[PDB]
């Protein structure tokens, strides 16, 4: 059901802020919130991310899975997916330059976003 | 047993005010008080809203079910029906202008409460 | 055993009292204190009240139990009858100028307290 | 200026509350609210009383004086006159059924107030 | 300098919500907040309302004066203009329906803002 | 001493990150941090801010004065200038897109910073 | 084993001071301390009280059971005997002027304690 | 003045109470509360007592001073007599059985309360 | 095996000081410490006292058993016995000038202490 | 006025109980309470110990002076002598055994108390 | 697989900083953080180390066990090698100059790490 | 295995500092911390103490067994062996001069340490 | 007096640990331990620094001036020399590779000290 | 005044106990407790110590002077002596082998204390 599976373009990323910096990192990816007519969340399984870190930025990452908490950490909210930026094969930070997200389901490879 | 299930014009809206700005939010409705005779809410079952948002008003929300919990936040009274405002596909918050609230039983779609 | 049943005429309210107004409300009836000849109690089951609100006064509340808690809230002392004025088909609060109080058993409906 | 001096009817009495018990006594009066047109509170300087306590209802306690707090317990408010129901020749409590108010001005003996 | 004088459009008030009822009070007005081109708030002396109360809303309340404290509660701001709708001939609370401003300088009787 | 007074292009900003949004707002700027031959921060005087707020971007904000407090929160460290972002005639927030920063001293309007 | 059921005169009574007045109640009496030789206090099962109350003094108040907790209050002790005085058909206080103590085993009703 | 002087006939006494005993010990008493005839508290000068202790019971105690604190240590009364049982010469308690009360004025030796 | 049942002449009595008095009382007595050749401590079972109370002194108190609780109140050390001086037929409290300590085994009487 | 300076034989001394041993020890003495008729306490000034240490018992301590605190702790009582033996020379503790007190006026050596 | 087992060079170690010293102190090594391409770290089972201790430096310390916790001490990280410095035999602590580690699998010794 | 069983040479006390004297006591022995080549700690069981108590030094204590808890009062450690100096027959403490350490395993009495 | 004060070589640097690094930075330097011999500390007066960074290692940092306050943060110590390295034109940390240290008195430019 | 300016010999040393090691160290002594006959120690000013660090032990420490405090930290004793050995030119602890003690009157060099 390929191309409505590509259409989920609203998305939210989850921040942290450094004080005594200027910058603020990402730390997750709070992704599909819920529209009235999307269930296609149920046939995607997999993520993998190639991101710029603090430290030799454009590099693959790995591939992980889902973990469906919430949506903005609101209790009273559907269960949507999220991306989480942590368990992945890194030691440094990541910053908000630019990013690949390559998704992976049975088959495809499709490149679902892009900042 | 139609008419009298149109016949429960009194009811509640829970608020939550907002301090540095002027203005109050609506964030559930404590519907139809227990009157003395009024015992349809049993046939009854699920509602939808089509409210006015922060941003993009009017559109359809979707179709939620009832929540069962008290009258007022009080423990020593009845179970009344409750519409929860936050379990609906939104992002925003909503405002006290104008609202309509379309309910379904088995295959009707009575307007039952317009502000 | 009808006489005796109408012969339990001490009671006593349980109040509740509101600053920045200067009147008190009334929020239960321990009724019926244990005197030494007074096991009547059991066959009375139902209670209905007739008060005076805050807005709307005479009017028909409804019918509800007993909850046999205590006396005067004290716990070394029998357990006695106590009207409950808040699990009724109310929504303001209820004040001390005139009531009338309903009784139901089998199929009497006695007038046992008239302040 | 004795008439408007008689007009200043509007008043209000401080409460205290007695648990275990179901009165309410008196230990207060928030005298003579301001409106728009009365300065007449100058001229006016001693106060006197006859209560009713909780023993020997009926007898002279005594003549005091004024002592200008505010209104209401507010602290953004001007100060308006009151009775203090405690610097007076009495050792019990003061009750809420009946009273009079003698008022004591250089040489007359208005009765200002009547329950 | 009389047309700037009603020049000063820009204004805010303060709230009060009241839980358990549905409605939101006022209880002052941040009035005049500096602008770049506005320093005829110094000539301007003495305020008059005549608002809705509670129980017999359309009144005169009386004239009082200003008491300029800051903006928005706000610390590092400038001293702008507050009308305290506290220290006014009332007893009640006062309401968001409708009112009328009467400002009283030297001899003009400007209505300033109406709601 | 012109030239020189055009030369001090390292600064900071002081920021503040709002959460359940994404985005951070600038508060204050902590300006030209002390430098070894850096003594022309006594003739400059004035500043003057033209930037893009959350509602109607691009205006003229005022003119106002340095306050020197520290560099970076720090203290044991030099004097430095500090551009205060919040004693200026706004309402709003301020984003960082961008912003324009035209400077006072005696007689010139040099622009001294822009991002 | 009537006589050595009448030879317990030691005896000790609970209290309780109330300030803002000059007396002292009894709230419960520790009864028949453990002396050498006495176990009859496992034939003798029921107590009756005729105190004197603050309204209405001397009067029967009816018929109850030991409850035998410790005696003054120690956990290393025996179990003694104690008559409570709440658990008894009254709404005032008891009073320390003059009592009887009327004892109720199979068929005697042996006073066995008069102050 | 010599007969009002004897006619203060009204006292009360401030009381101890000793748990894991009995009894109330007297340690001290409000002496002469104001009535609306009485300033022949100023002649009056020096107490003395003839008590009964724990220990040898009726002996002379000592002749010393009054000290004027308050009436029922209340705040808002006058200042009444107040005569202090602890500054004499015993090193015991004092009971409440009998008690022998010497004043001294300049050179009377009334018995002014007996208990 | 009498002899050395009679030999275990250390012992340790357990103490309770009462300020605002000159005097310290027993309330308990840690017997017999482990020795390295000491286990008689089996076959005796009851003791008794006859001691020196602070209202008429020698009497006969009572028979009661061990509590092998711990010596010294110290939780690494053996498990030694204990005379309770509180589980007796008393109702004041001991002093330290003379008592006697009778002991029974199956049919001895053995004096063991002296004090 | 020799005699009667020897006439004062009610003493007291202040304790100190060291647990996890069985005895008190001495550690001031509160002298000479004040009785009716006794004010020699003006004319003698300095005090003088030969006590039994824990450590080489009788020896010679030195002369020290009075220092007129209270009596028995207790702040509403007059001023009486107190022996401080703590400012003396020793190094260890004092004992209950037995004690001589010899006391200095300007050439008398007279001993005052002996236990 | 020997080769990609010697090849996992990058490493961490676990620091611990005394104060009123000058040096660190080594009590932990997170080992072989987890890339994309190293599950090697199964068939190694135990581990040896030759460091230089604060006193008689370098010298055999003994084989012990991994304890695969986490990655610098985060909870969401995959679990990677740890050896722990302390589970070893030895008294004082490890410094930082130098260090040998020989890696025991079933019958290889070989040297991985090298400081 | 006899002589192995004799080296182990290496061992702690564990002390406790009393203030206000000058001197450390012994509570125990963390005794044979692990080396590299040493598991005859399982052959032996039991100790036996002669050391030099505060009062009367020099005497048998009595024999005791081991307690395994650990090394230094560290959690990541091995078990070693401990000699309790607490559960023995004393009363008094132990001090540092001199002490003999008897040991018995089946039917060896070697001694192991001397200091 | 040139030579001694070239011998002071004795000296100690101010840490600082970071976790989640692996390093320690350097924040003071606690100079010149008062020895025996030594008060050339008050002609010498201002200090200049020449450090690694944590960007652009090798740079002039600037002169400043001596803050004689302790000696390894110890309240009971002589008063020594401290260069503080924060008063100092940087803005990164300071690292513990490699450091040059010119010393200025009134026209030396003494290396008083190396890493 | 010579000899008696020896004759002192009793003292007392000031400890610190160190944990995870098993020693006590020295950091100060209260010298000459004051004694009947001993005002000598106004006379001697300074003094001058020869210790064992624990680095380097036996060297010239320095000249200091007395600080009179108190006596083994009492508030009630006499001012006494007190050798700090804090302020002298050391960098490590002290410890209790041994010690010499150089004391400085105004010409001589008498060793007053050796351990």
């Given at each position: 059901d390929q191309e409505?599976m590509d ?33 296609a969340?149920?046939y995607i399984q997999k993520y993998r ?52 997200l390559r998704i992976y389901a049975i088959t495809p490879d499709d490149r679902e976003?892009?900042?």
């Open positions: 409505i259409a989920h373009k609203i998305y939210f990323a989850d921040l942290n802020f450094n004080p005594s910096t200027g910058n603020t990192y990402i730390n997750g990816m709070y992704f599909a919130p819920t529209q009235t007519n999307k269930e969340l149920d991310v190639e991101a710029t870190l603090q430290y030799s930025g454009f590099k693959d990452i790995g591939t992980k899975d889902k973990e469906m908490r919430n949506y903005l950490g609101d209790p009273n909210q559907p269960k949507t997916n999220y991306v989480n930026l942590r368990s992945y094969f890194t030691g440094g930070e990541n910053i908000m330059t630019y990013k690949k976003l892009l900042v």
